[PDB]
Structures are given as structure tokens and as C-alpha cells.
């Protein structure tokens, strides 16, 4: 997996060190190769550890004289690849075009070497363990490393300008998946100058190279790729009216659109590629004229439905408990009424109407949530903050708990408060999803969703051991006293709860001077103060101050991505008699079935 | 000590000012030296204050003509050193090679001056009072100041290329203990080119120069010294596979390893030398594959043992107190049971099993802690944060208090809560030691251990005088009233405790409107509010905010050092049938008994 790589590389190097002809080809001798070529009894096709040919070990250490003498001694060593596991289809041409010497590649092409030999192992394969991905073909190798006089020398010998390899990619996808981009823009331009030919082709995953430029986030290759579609109109003064093309920027023929494909990626450039001009102007116009006046009425309808659920939950049926309460610590003066007395009057008919509209809202929420999560994977939909993981989780939780409340009401079971309080508090804390489209409540809900999983997760794992270590001491100091004067510290769970409440200072310190408290309680409380309340509760404020100072641009760079996410979701969901196209047409203007855009510009 | 240096330097300068021949040699006269050399009655071997020879005072003020005329007048003044206290074995050759003139050194070597004269005083000695440490030999002087044409001129006269001096050092250790390093890398390279010869030699303390490079933290000399062992394998494309050597980086033959020697230093570069490549890759692999799956089960076993101790401490034997409580301020309804009624049932047998496993855990903690602190000094083990001083202190305290609890239980003494509460709260606050290997709770426990000794130590020395000055005023205002309406402010210790509680606002302000409080209490409380609660308690938050802003990189530069500390500690502690080696072997690959490492790299 990892140590197997060292296990095979040491074996290859040990075989190279042991074999004398390969050692001479490594050291670049002349008389030793001359005597081993003159003595014809020695074998020249001998293999090392991992398919190691003498031409391979010459080209790996760049021995031009040894390679030329080897091909003029026996030229039948270029068309034979390796056969072992990490380097399956490697060739001398492959390692020569990676090592970037023109003369050895010219000598190999003069000595009859094929240019369509494929390499399918663990070396040249898209995986996070290998450092580089160059492709599985010599033209992909040359155009990916960025040479200039090897690409013509290979294409004029017919080396598959439109090639295919593992995972269905091609040379344009390989040039897009690169971190240099400045000596790769010219290479992509030259290969597009050489040749549904090569741009509109999909891979095995279904990624046209424009959508791969999207999902990988290379903004400079995107900004060059836009300039092979940009129609330019007139210019006068300092202003110019460029006319872009959006027939790839929004799909409308396939459900998988470019914008839906780029708003739900997992990298750190899918929210920076949404700042270039012909996608920013488009989603700004479409958002400001089509996303606010439906999100506002959706938020109003959700808040109206939740106030119906809150009032229907308040007006709950209750009957007086006839069994007595002969216990000094028992209080229950109302009891949950039986189901057979739930239809008695007009008020109970109104409560029935409220229960019906609550159950209808719960089932339409569940049926509007489930078939969208069956398509996108659960990780991409529950994880990210651009899409709404920690709101869809509590929405599905609210729907399942309201359904369990309705079933528990119909089966005539006691204890309705146990799911009712949870369903109500989650359904009212889930209104925060409708605080995406407003720039006031925009970055603040991102800050609180970041602050919970960033600092409260770090802080409660060190609050739990302090309250769990101090509640036991408070209980041991107060298990030899009376529970008449000090109500707290009687049993262990109320001791734990009261120690946590004294930790957050929401309750007062226990004090009663009708008795005399023990010295051990007094000294451990005077230590508990300046260990757990003066220090740690005032260090939390400084830590969430510095997180707020340092993450003061991720919220402003993530809010635009989540508002484009809501625009794309509503454009896919709501019907298309109410969601028309974007941009001008081209059928009534002498162009034909290509929707355009016309963004006015101003420089100087 | 310090003023003695001024006392001897003024005496030397006064003797130079008083003696006429030395004054002429200072002023660089010609006719005065000519007449004092022609008049042969004058003595030339006369000594000043601290062994002051005329050749010494010529070479100290760089008088080439005076020195040449002195050696051509009487050449018997070069082989005689000084004899007084601060400058014992100083020579004209020593001060000439420090003053860096080639001609005077050539003249002294032509006039028969020895090159192995040693200087052992208070001047040339490793101590924090002297500014520089250059060594105790002329070759150490030349190679430490960094000359180029003096080192060959001295070594070709046989001036001890492999020398020894005080504290057992040599010239490579002297070149390592230097703050220049850029004109010292070439000097170290030239001396290693000139010559178990010189690299594998130890000093008197037991420091091979590689381990001295470690313990002194000079990263550039470390990064050059690594490149005399780095074996290079093939290269192709932009990636290269260097093959380092770890036979010095981890010892395995001596208990004192390089990594244990470098993780427990007291400087500010022992945590920066742990970022270079062939130690970072090694400890990253060894930590992620061998330190987490034993630290996790160690934390689980410690938390399980502490929950056994907490439950065994809760289930404590108690007998009802038969003596009466005829006192309006006495509450004791349960009394500690006698030892003879501690084995009565199955529950008391279970409590006995809990006491036995608690005492066994305490004695294995103490026997696992003590023989490790007997070897490393108490300062290095209790002080630093990389090693765990403020956790080993509270662990030894918990073990001694649990042993004192067991002895106090067997001797049938009352008052078990007095050590039991302390032992329980320290044993539960000591779980924080197992928050080193997790990157969530990593920097936060460093922040709280820094915040206590950095700000709470500064703050409680100015909280103590405010509460000690306000509790007395609150007592004087309320010693002429009734303790029936106001429970607080009755005697002085409860007045002090209630003033501290009102300082931290955990208790409410005393108010009772069934009576009339004095005007003096009212005005001093209205001053106590906006002097001690609005201001100082809200300045503490700002101070621990700015400490958190400024020490936001020492925690991220110290956490890696303490996780390498725990890796080295577990590698030394746990047995070696479960802790195997690191890196590949070299016996089955044609190298022989040298464990290697193979780190893959990528540039361009
Ligand atoms: O209308 C919806 C949302 C469901 N709901 C309602 O009905 C009523 O009010 C709500 C209030 C709070 C929470 C949910 C609702 O459908 C599901 C849905 N929400 C989203 S948000 C971003 C995306 C997205 C877009 C493109 C790619 C990937 C993800 C997304 C999605 O794909 N589906
Ligand atoms: O609880 C804890 C620590 C324990 N731990 C949980 O409990 C939930 O699974 C976990 C998964 C991994 C690690 C720890 C835990 O402390 C921090 C903390 N993180 C969160 S995330 C959501 C909540 C939450 C808020 C209100 C009600 C219910 C849950 C939450 C929380 O209350 N605390
Ligand atoms: O296993 C140990 C630690 C002792 N303990 C346990 O047994 C049980 O759980 C514990 C929980 C909290 C505290 C202690 C324990 O031994 C002692 C020990 N701890 C350390 S931490 C770093 C070093 C170190 C490494 C290299 C050089 C210098 C110091 C170190 C050490 O040398 N000894
Ligand atoms: O106490 C003080 C000041 C008095 N002073 C001690 O008392 C301990 O020796 C000292 C040594 C030098 C200077 C002052 C003191 O204020 C600050 C302060 N520093 C610390 S360090 C550990 C604790 C601690 C925490 C909980 C229980 C027991 C001790 C601590 C503390 O409570 N306060």
C-alpha cells in the first residue's frame, strides 16, 4: 500500500546493483559495453526485478551513448514493455519523454518504437498516494510535462491526438488537472489548434472538459476557455459591450447542469470559480429577479405553518388526575386525556384541523426531502455548509418526530411531552435555513454553525471532566449532612446538574447561614471559583474572539456560494412556466437556438 | 565575579600606562624602541599586571613594526605564556590569530612559536558571563573566527587537527556552537575534508557532534550535515526518491537516543529542529502507525480506573450518629463507620474489591513514575511543557494522597473527606495528560496551562489585596448590627469568603428590606461595584484576549514537540516485541546492518 512501494524499489535497485550489464549501463562505461557487445554469448533481453530492460535502465539515468550503442547492438528491445505490478506498461519511450531529451526520443522513433503503448499500473493512476498524474499515453506525457518540440514530433507520427485511457479521460482533461497552468495554457491552445471532435467529448464519469474546469476550479484555464466563445460587439470611448455565450454555463437540456455540478464540489476553488464575469453576472441577475420573491414567500409560509403547530401544541387536551398524590415530593395536577374524549366541541374540532395540517406539512416536507437525497450521496448532502447538511438533518429529525408523535397519540400511550418538546424545539430552531438570502443574517449564521463544531466541540470535552471531577467532590463533602437546609447535593444526578449550573453561574452559589457548612466544602468551592469560572469561562471568550478574527473572510467567500446553491435548487425545483430562461434569444436575431448574454463593460 | 573583571582590566591598563617600554610599544614609536634596544641594560622580559609581555601588548594593539623589532632584538619572548588569574595560558600567537593578521602569525611561526599552548582561565571558558566561546587552542581560534589562509598554515605545522581541551570538546563542537553558520559551514567542510577519526568522537559530557547539533538546534548545520549521508536514487520528471540514513537519528544500541536527547532540551530550537525532513517523516510515520493505537487504549484504561475509584468513593460506609446535636448550628446526621463493620455483606465485599484495585493502581502509578524521575533531573522533568511537569506533579500528589487515605482508613482515624476530596479532584483533573495526541484538544490544554501561570498568577496577587481591603470594611460596617437579618458579615473568615464571592458575582448582593442598612455600607458597596466588578473582572477578559492573540503560534510550534515526546516515551517504555524498528533493512539488500529510509520527494 505504502511500504510495498519501498519493498519493490529496493528490490529493483538491488537487482540493478547486482547485474553487471545493467550496472555498466548505470555507470555509463564504454569498454565494458564494448566487450559485452562483442562477446555475443551474453544475453541482452535479460529482465531485472520489475520488467527492467537495459534500455529502461539506460533511459532512467540518461545515458545517451549507452542507449545508442545498445540499439545499434540489438534493436529488438524497444517494443517490449514491463510485466510486473507497480510499473506494468512502462516503455523506454515513456521514461524518455518524461526525462525530456529530444535526441533519445528521436533515436527511439528512428529505431521503430510504437507510440500507442499503454501503461496501466499503480504508478500512472489517479490516486492520492502517487504524487503526480501525467496520463497513460506518450502524448499525454509530453503535453502534460509541457514540452514544445516533442508534441509535433509525436503527432506527425500519428500518436492519437484524440486518445482514451483509464477512467475515460483524454489529453485535455489531463492538461486541465494540472497545477502549473501558465505553460499549460499554450499547450491546451496548441492541441485545440491541432484538433464533436475533442471539446464536446465526455469521460467515463460524464465530465466534458468545461465541466471538469468547473469542478476542479482552475480559474485561469476557465478564463482562457471563455475567450473561445466570447463574441465582441462595438467599442467607443472607454466602454465595450462584450457578448458572452451561456449554452454551456446553464444546461437546460440535461438535469445535471454546470452550475449544479460546480456548486456541490468538495474542493476550495468551487466557490472561487463563481466570481468570473459570465457566471457572476448571470447568477446575480437571476438571483435578484427570481430568487428573492419566492424565498420570501417560502419563509413566510414556513413561519406561518410553525406558528400553527405551536398554537396547536399549546392547546393540548388535559383531564384532572383522580388518583391521589400521597407523597411529599409529587406534583401532577393534570393528566393526559384519553383519545375517546378528543372530539367534544368546536375547540376540539379546531385542534383536529390543526393536527391535520401539521401532519400534512410533515409528510410534504419528508416527500420533498427524500427523493433529492436518494440521488446526491449522503456525504455531499449532509456534510457541506454550501448545501445545508446541518439543516436537512434537523428537518428530517423534526418530520420523523412529528410522525412518531401522531402515531403515539393514536396508539393511546402516555408521555406525549417526550417527543413533543423535541419536535417543537427543533422545528423552531430550523427557521435559520431561511436566513441565506438576507445579507444581514447571512454571515452570522455561518459564524454560529462554524463556532459550534469548531470551538464548542473542543470545549465541552474539557468541561465534562471538570464538572465530573467536581460534582463527586461536592457530593462527598455533603453526604453526611441534612437535605433540609441544602437542597442541592443530595444524590449524584442532581449533584452533577447543580455543579454544571454553578459552572455556568446561571444559578447562585449555595449558601445558608442557619447552619454551619464544612471547611472542606468551603475550600474546594473557593478553588472551584478561580479554577473553573474566572479562568475557563473567560478563556472561551478570547478563543471565540480569535476564531472570529481569523475566519472573517471564509464567511464572506462562502455566503455567495450558498446563495448560488439556493438559486440553483429553486431553479431545478419550481416549474418552468414560472421559471423562464436567462439572457436574450438568438432565433429572432439571425443566430439560431443559442441563448446569449450581453454584459456591458468599462475599462480605463 | 563581574566587578573583578573591571578590577583586573584597570590594573592591566594602569601598568601599561606606567611602564615606559610597554607605553612605547602601545604608541608605536620607532626611536624609543631603537634606544631601548640599543641600551642593553634595560630588561626585556619584564611582566606587567596579568602576565603582560611586550610582545603581548604589541599584538593586542596590532603594532607589526614594534613586534618585528622586538623579535629581532630578543626572540625569547614567544614561548612564555602568562601566569595570572583571568588570562592564564594566553600567547602572542593566540591574540594574533584572534586579531586576524597573516603577517604577524607568519613572523611568529618563523620565530619558533609552539602551536599547542593551552589557555585555561576565566576568559576562554564556556560560561554565560563571557561573551564569546572560541576554544582553548589556536586551531580552534582560527577555525572558529572563520579565517581561510591561517588554518592551512597551522595544520601543515601539525597543530592538532584532532585536539582536546577543557570539557572534552574539539574543533567540530566549537564550530557547531557558533551563531554565524554561513562562513562556518565551509570551515566545517574543509576540516572534515582534512580529516572513528573525528566525527564519531564524544566529549566529556557524552555528545557526539551530531547530537550536539541536535541539542543546540542549529538547523542549517544540521541540514548540511545530513547531506554527507543522503544516498540518492534515480530521478525522472520532477520527482526524486532520496534515501536517507537513520542509524544516528534513532540509536537502538544506547538508551540515550538522539531523539530523546533533543526532545528534552531547554533552548528555543529543540522544537524547530524537529521539522527537517529525515526526522519529521520518521516520527510522522512512527506516530501515526504506532502511537495512537496504544495511547487510545491507555486513555480508556485510565478513565475506566478513575470511574472505578469514583464509584468506590461514592459507596462509602456510614453509621448513624447516636450522640445528640443539641446546638442550633450543628448538622451531622451520618457518622463514619468503624473499621470492624467494614466486611458485613456482598456490597462491602464489592467495596473491598474496589479498594484493592484502587491501591494497586496507585502503587503501579508510583512505581512507573519514580525510576524515570531518578535519572532525568527534577528541573527538566518538572519544569518544561514538552515533557509534562504540571501533570506528573499532580499524579505523584494523587498517588501519595490515595496512599495516605488507605493508611488513614486502616489506622481508624476520623475525617476521611479531608484527603479523599483532594485525591478525587486531582485524579479527575489529571485526565488532561491524555489530550496530547488529539488535534482538537491539542492546543487548548497548552493554552490553559499557559494562561494559568501567565495571567492568573499576575491577577490573583492584585485580587487578594482588593478583597482583603474590602472585607474588613464590610465587617466594620456590619459589626454593630444583627446576624438575624444579614447572614453574611458576622465574623472575619465568612466576611472574607463572602467578599470574594461578591467579587466573582457567583452569589447575589446582600439585600433585605425588612430592616434599614447603613449609609456607609451603601456607599462603599456602590464604590465596590464599579471598582472591583465592572472594571477589573472585565479587564481580565481583554488581557487573556491579547495573550491568546500573541501566543497563537507557540502552541502550534509546541504541540508537535510534545507529541514527539510522547512517541519517544512510549517507544522507550513498551517492549520491543511489540515496538519493532523503523524503516527498511539493509541486510537482505546488499548493504549490511544499516537501517535506511526512503522518502519520496517532488520539486518544480
Ligand atoms: O426544496 C428543498 C428543501 C426542503 N425544505 C422545504 O421544502 C421546506 O423548507 C425547508 C426549510 C428548511 C430545510 C429544508 C426545507 O429540497 C431539498 C434541497 N435543498 C437544497 S439546498 C441546496 C441544494 C443543492 C443544490 C444543488 C446541488 C446540491 C444541493 C438542495 C437540494 O438539492 N435539495
Ligand atoms: O456533546 C459534546 C461531546 C459528545 N458528543 C456528542 O454529544 C454528539 O456526538 C459526538 C460525536 C463526536 C464527538 C463528540 C460527540 O460536546 C460538544 C457538542 N457538539 C455538538 S454537535 C450538536 C450538539 C447538540 C446540541 C444540542 C442538543 C443536542 C446536540 C452538540 C453538543 O451538545 N455538544
Ligand atoms: O509512562 C509514564 C507516564 C506515567 N503515567 C502512567 O503510567 C499512567 O498514565 C499517566 C497519566 C498522567 C500522567 C502520568 C501517567 O512514564 C513517565 C514518563 N512520562 C513522560 S512524558 C515525556 C517524557 C520524556 C520523554 C523523553 C525525555 C524526557 C521525558 C516522559 C518520561 O520520561 N517518563
Ligand atoms: O495563589 C496565588 C498566589 C499565591 N501562591 C500560591 O498559592 C502557590 O505558590 C505560589 C508560588 C509563587 C507565587 C505565588 C504563589 O495566585 C495565583 C495562583 N497560581 C497558582 S499555580 C497553582 C494553583 C492552584 C490552583 C488550584 C488549587 C491549588 C493551587 C494556583 C492558584 O490557585 N493561584
XYZ file of N, CA, C and O in Angstrom, chain B residues 331-383:
212
model
N -25.111 20.319 62.233
C -25.746 19.328 61.376
C -24.750 18.204 61.101
O -23.728 18.408 60.434
N -25.010 17.032 61.683
C -24.255 15.824 61.359
C -25.197 14.656 61.641
O -25.346 14.248 62.794
N -25.831 14.142 60.591
C -26.787 13.056 60.753
C -26.182 11.694 60.421
O -26.735 10.666 60.838
N -25.051 11.652 59.719
C -24.320 10.416 59.477
C -22.887 10.565 59.970
O -22.303 11.650 59.923
N -22.332 9.457 60.450
C -21.003 9.409 61.039
C -20.217 8.302 60.347
O -20.797 7.316 59.886
N -18.901 8.492 60.232
C -18.039 7.492 59.613
C -18.021 6.203 60.430
O -17.790 6.224 61.642
N -18.270 5.080 59.757
C -18.377 3.793 60.429
C -17.004 3.266 60.825
O -15.991 3.553 60.183
N -16.982 2.486 61.903
C -15.762 1.866 62.394
C -15.285 0.791 61.412
O -16.062 0.245 60.622
N -13.974 0.517 61.450
C -13.353 -0.444 60.540
C -13.843 -1.870 60.784
O -13.883 -2.677 59.849
N -14.260 -2.192 62.011
C -14.670 -3.557 62.327
C -16.008 -3.938 61.706
O -16.353 -5.123 61.695
N -16.765 -2.972 61.189
C -18.021 -3.227 60.490
C -17.908 -2.912 59.002
O -18.865 -2.462 58.371
N -16.734 -3.153 58.421
C -16.499 -2.889 57.008
C -16.610 -4.134 56.141
O -16.531 -4.022 54.915
N -16.762 -5.313 56.737
C -16.978 -6.556 55.998
C -18.274 -7.171 56.523
O -18.243 -8.021 57.414
N -19.417 -6.747 55.976
C -20.697 -7.217 56.500
C -21.535 -7.937 55.445
O -22.373 -8.777 55.794
N -21.321 -7.650 54.161
C -22.212 -8.189 53.135
C -21.501 -8.220 51.786
O -20.305 -7.925 51.675
N -22.271 -8.574 50.751
C -21.759 -8.644 49.388
C -21.384 -7.264 48.863
O -20.410 -7.124 48.112
N -22.137 -6.233 49.257
C -21.814 -4.873 48.838
C -20.508 -4.398 49.464
O -19.713 -3.711 48.810
N -20.248 -4.782 50.712
C -18.978 -4.418 51.321
C -17.826 -5.261 50.788
O -16.688 -4.781 50.746
N -18.095 -6.489 50.335
C -17.067 -7.241 49.618
C -16.733 -6.584 48.279
O -15.563 -6.545 47.867
N -17.747 -6.039 47.602
C -17.532 -5.322 46.348
C -16.738 -4.038 46.589
O -15.818 -3.702 45.827
N -17.053 -3.325 47.676
C -16.278 -2.145 48.056
C -14.839 -2.501 48.421
O -13.916 -1.720 48.151
N -14.624 -3.681 49.009
C -13.268 -4.139 49.291
C -12.494 -4.418 48.007
O -11.306 -4.081 47.908
N -13.156 -5.021 47.013
C -12.522 -5.263 45.714
C -12.161 -3.941 45.036
O -11.072 -3.792 44.454
N -13.042 -2.945 45.159
C -12.744 -1.625 44.620
C -11.570 -0.947 45.306
O -10.735 -0.316 44.647
N -11.474 -1.090 46.634
C -10.337 -0.516 47.353
C -9.030 -1.202 46.972
O -7.993 -0.537 46.840
N -9.066 -2.523 46.758
C -7.854 -3.236 46.355
C -7.385 -2.823 44.963
O -6.181 -2.624 44.751
N -8.312 -2.663 44.008
C -7.858 -2.265 42.673
C -7.427 -0.798 42.647
O -6.521 -0.434 41.884
N -7.993 0.047 43.523
C -7.519 1.427 43.625
C -6.100 1.494 44.188
O -5.252 2.228 43.661
N -5.812 0.706 45.230
C -4.474 0.720 45.819
C -3.450 0.111 44.860
O -2.316 0.604 44.748
N -3.848 -0.923 44.104
C -2.955 -1.493 43.095
C -2.664 -0.500 41.967
O -1.506 -0.382 41.532
N -3.671 0.270 41.542
C -3.426 1.307 40.551
C -2.522 2.413 41.062
O -1.665 2.917 40.326
N -2.670 2.778 42.339
C -1.816 3.816 42.912
C -0.365 3.358 43.005
O 0.556 4.128 42.691
N -0.139 2.099 43.382
C 1.247 1.665 43.523
C 1.888 1.404 42.153
O 3.097 1.623 41.989
N 1.108 1.031 41.130
C 1.742 0.869 39.821
C 2.012 2.238 39.180
O 3.017 2.399 38.478
N 1.190 3.257 39.478
C 1.484 4.620 39.026
C 2.770 5.136 39.669
O 3.649 5.686 38.986
N 2.922 4.919 40.980
C 4.114 5.413 41.668
C 5.377 4.678 41.221
O 6.432 5.305 41.033
N 5.289 3.360 41.013
C 6.453 2.611 40.558
C 6.735 2.792 39.074
O 7.827 2.441 38.621
N 5.780 3.305 38.304
C 6.047 3.660 36.921
C 6.534 5.091 36.774
O 7.026 5.457 35.704
N 6.394 5.909 37.818
C 6.831 7.299 37.782
C 8.209 7.528 38.397
O 8.998 8.310 37.858
N 8.509 6.866 39.524
C 9.726 7.192 40.290
C 11.042 6.844 39.585
O 11.924 7.720 39.508
N 11.260 5.622 39.049
C 12.572 5.343 38.428
C 12.830 6.095 37.135
O 13.949 6.021 36.614
N 11.838 6.791 36.592
C 12.078 7.667 35.460
C 12.506 9.056 35.911
O 13.251 9.733 35.197
N 12.071 9.492 37.092
C 12.486 10.796 37.598
C 13.812 10.707 38.347
O 14.444 11.740 38.601
N 14.262 9.500 38.703
C 15.585 9.395 39.320
C 16.731 9.601 38.335
O 17.861 9.844 38.768
N 16.483 9.492 37.031
C 17.541 9.623 36.035
C 17.606 11.035 35.455
O 18.640 11.701 35.563
N 16.525 11.498 34.817
C 16.444 12.892 34.394
C 16.315 13.763 35.634
O 15.670 13.374 36.616
N 16.958 14.931 35.609
C 16.913 15.825 36.750
C 15.518 16.354 37.014
O 14.639 16.334 36.154
N 15.315 16.813 38.250
C 13.987 17.249 38.660
C 13.575 18.538 37.965
O 12.381 18.756 37.737
N 14.543 19.383 37.598
C 14.224 20.633 36.916
C 13.705 20.378 35.507
O 12.675 20.934 35.110
N 14.391 19.515 34.748
C 13.984 19.233 33.374
C 12.677 18.456 33.310
O 11.965 18.533 32.306
N 12.340 17.714 34.361
C 11.144 16.884 34.338
C 9.929 17.564 34.951
O 8.800 17.265 34.550
N 10.120 18.455 35.920
C 9.005 19.213 36.468
C 8.780 20.548 35.775
O 7.701 21.129 35.927
N 9.758 21.058 35.035
C 9.637 22.404 34.520
C 8.924 22.537 33.191
O 7.936 23.270 33.086
